[PDB]
C-alpha cells in the first residue's frame, strides 16, 4: 500500500467544524483530532473521527502536548462500536500546515497500520473550493546517507458519502 | 403548544450511520443536548453504545472524555434502530425509557428505521412516556406519545454541506 487518493465522509467535515466551534477556538488557534476509516488500499477512506485535547505554545512551536492516553482510551471505545473503522491518522483546522506537524505525525505512526494521513479541514471555509487538504509524510535518503529529507506529500481528495449519509445530507439541505 | 425535538446535522448523520452499520441488528446510543422552554429539546450530538448482544462505565468514560474536548452537554435521552421494523416502543424500551425519565421528566426516546429510510424520507420518531400517577401519592391504554421532530444547522454547516458533490 503506497497511497494515491483520499475520500472524506461529510460527517468528518461536520465533526471537525463542530469540534472547532465548540472549543471557542481563537484566531491563530487550531483544533486537533483523530481520523478513522480504511487505509490499507491505494485510496484512503476517511469515515469517522473524534476530538483530542491538545495544547501548544503559540510562541514556541517546539512545545505541544498530545494526550497519548486519551488517543488509546478513546480508540478502545471506537473499536467496541465499529472494529472496521481503524485509526488512520489525524486532523486539524489549519488553515495551513504548522512546523510541529511532522513531529506530531511521528507520534501517530505508533497507532496506525500504515503511513498516517494528515487531513486539514478548513473550518473558515474561505477557499470556496474544497475545505480539505490531505497529506502523507515521505522521506528520501539522498546522496547515500549524508542527508535524508522529510516532507508532506499532498494527496488529492474527494467528498464521498455512503447511502445513509447521502439521505441525511439531502434531508438537511431539503 | 406542541413540543419539538430539534436534531442537529451530526446527530442525524451519526444515528443513520450507526443504524445502517448494525443491520440486521438493533443498535443503541445516547443523545446529548439541552432542554430549553417547555416546547423545545435540542439534540446536539449523539454517541453509539456497544452491542450488548446501557453500560454505565462506557457511558461515564465517554461523557468524561467528551467534556475534555468541549462537549459538555447533558444526556437528554437515547436512540435506537428498528432495522426494517418502523417506529414504536417495545415493553423493554418503555422500561428503559422509564429509567431515563427518573433523571429528566422530559427525556426523549428516538427510534430510527435505517432500512425504510431512503432518499427523500427518513423514518424516525421521538417518544415520551404518557403521564400516569397524576393521582398517586408521594409518601384501551397507550403507554407513550410522539413529539414533533425538526432539524437544525448553523449557516456554517449549511455552507459545508454544499460541498457534497
Amino acid at each position, epitope marked *: 500500500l503506497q497511497h494515491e487518493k483520499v475520500t472524506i465522509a461529510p460527517l468528518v467535515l461536520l465533526s471537525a467544524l463542530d469540534h472547532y466551534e465548540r472549543t471557542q477556538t481563537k484566531e491563530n488557534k487550531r483544533c486537533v483530532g483523530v481520523i478513522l476509516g480504511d487505509a490499507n488500499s491505494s485510496t484512503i477512506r476517511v469515515t469517522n473521527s473524534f476530538a483530542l485535547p491538545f495544547e501548544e505554545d503559540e510562541k514556541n512551536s517546539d512545545v505541544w502536548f498530545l494526550d497519548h492516553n486519551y488517543i488509546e482510551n478513546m480508540n478502545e471505545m471506537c473499536k467496541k462500536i465499529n472494529a472496521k473503522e481503524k485509526l488512520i491518522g489525524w486532523y486539524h483546522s489549519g488553515p495551513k500546515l504548522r512546523a510541529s506537524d511532522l513531529k506530531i505525525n511521528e507520534l501517530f505512526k505508533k497507532y496506525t497500520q500504515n503511513n498516517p494521513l494528515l487531513l486539514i479541514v478548513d473550518v473558515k471555509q474561505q477557499g470556496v473550493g474544497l475545505p480539505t487538504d490531505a497529506y502523507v509524510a515521505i522521506e528520501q535518503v539522498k546522496d547515500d546517507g549524508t542527508s535524508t529529507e522529510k516532507t508532506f506529500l499532498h494527496l488529492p481528495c474527494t467528498i464521498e458519502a455512503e447511502e445513509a449519509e447521502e439521505i441525511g445530507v439531502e434531508h438537511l439541505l431539503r | 403548544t406542541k413540543e419539538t425535538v430539534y436534531i442537529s446535522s451530526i446527530a442525524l448523520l451519526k444515528m443513520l450511520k450507526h443504524g445502517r452499520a448494525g443491520v440486521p441488528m438493533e443498535v443503541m446510543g445516547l443523545m446529548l443536548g439541552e432542554f*430549553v*422552554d417547555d416546547y*423545545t429539546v*435540542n439534540v446536539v450530538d449523539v454517541f453509539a453504545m456497544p452491542q450488548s448482544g446501557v453500560d454505565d462505565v462506557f457511558q461515564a468514560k465517554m461523557m468524561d472524555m467528551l467534556k475534555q474536548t468541549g462537549r459538555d452537554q447533558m444526556v437528554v435521552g437515547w436512540y435506537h434502530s428498528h432495522p426494517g421494523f418502523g417506529c414504536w416502543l417495545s415493553s423493554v424500551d418503555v422500561n428503559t425509557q422509564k429509567s431515563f425519565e427518573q433523571l429528566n421528566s422530559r427525556a426523549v426516546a428516538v427510534v430510527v428505521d435505517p432500512i425504510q429510510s431512503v432518499k427523500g424520507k427518513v423514518v424516525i420518531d421521538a417518544f415520551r412516556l404518557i403521564d400516569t400517577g397524576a393521582l398517586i401519592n408521594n409518601l384501551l391504554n397507550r403507554h407513550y406519545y410522539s413529539l414533533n421532530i425538526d432539524y*437544525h*444547522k*448553523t449557516a456554517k454547516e449549511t455552507k459545508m454541506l454544499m460541498n457534497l458533490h
Partner: nanobody, 118 residues
C-alpha cells in the same frame, strides 16, 4: 456588521438599564450573551422573532426581560435590580437555534459594556 447594540454604561447597584439590538439585514432566534474579564461567555436570554417565546439563565430570571419588536427589527433587554456580578460586555446574537450554546448562533454584534458599581 449586522447586529448593533446600544444602551448600557455605568449604573449603580440596584438600578436599571435598557439594552437594544438592531438587526439591519434580515434568523428566527435572537439572544443576549455576556462576557466578563477572565470568564467564558455566558448565556443570558433568548427569544423567537415570531411568537416571542423567551428563555432565561437562572441567575437573571425575574430581573431581566428580553423582548422583541418585529416591525423595528429590534430586540431588547430590560435589566432591573442590577448587581455587581452583572458587570460585563453584553452581546446580541441571531441564528436558528433556540437555546443556550453560543456556538450555535450564526452572527454577533460587537458588544456593549455594562458596569454595575461595587
Amino acid at each position: 456588521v449586522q447586529l448593533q447594540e446600544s444602551g448600557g454604561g455605568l449604573v449603580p447597584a440596584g438600578g436599571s438599564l435598557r439594552l437594544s439590538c438592531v438587526d439591519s439585514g434580515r434568523s428566527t432566534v435572537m439572544a443576549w450573551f455576556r462576557q466578563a474579564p477572565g470568564k467564558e461567555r455566558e448565556f443570558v436570554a433568548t427569544i423567537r422573532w415570531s411568537g416571542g417565546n423567551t428563555y432565561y439563565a437562572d441567575s437573571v430570571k425575574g430581573r431581566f426581560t428580553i423582548s422583541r419588536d418585529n416591525a423595528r427589527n429590534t430586540v431588547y433587554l430590560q435589566m432591573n435590580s442590577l448587581k455587581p456580578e452583572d458587570t460585563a460586555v453584553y452581546y446580541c446574537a441571531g441564528g436558528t437555534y433556540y437555546g443556550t450554546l453560543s456556538y450555535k448562533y450564526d452572527f454577533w454584534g460587537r458588544g456593549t459594556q455594562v458596569t454595575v458599581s461595587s
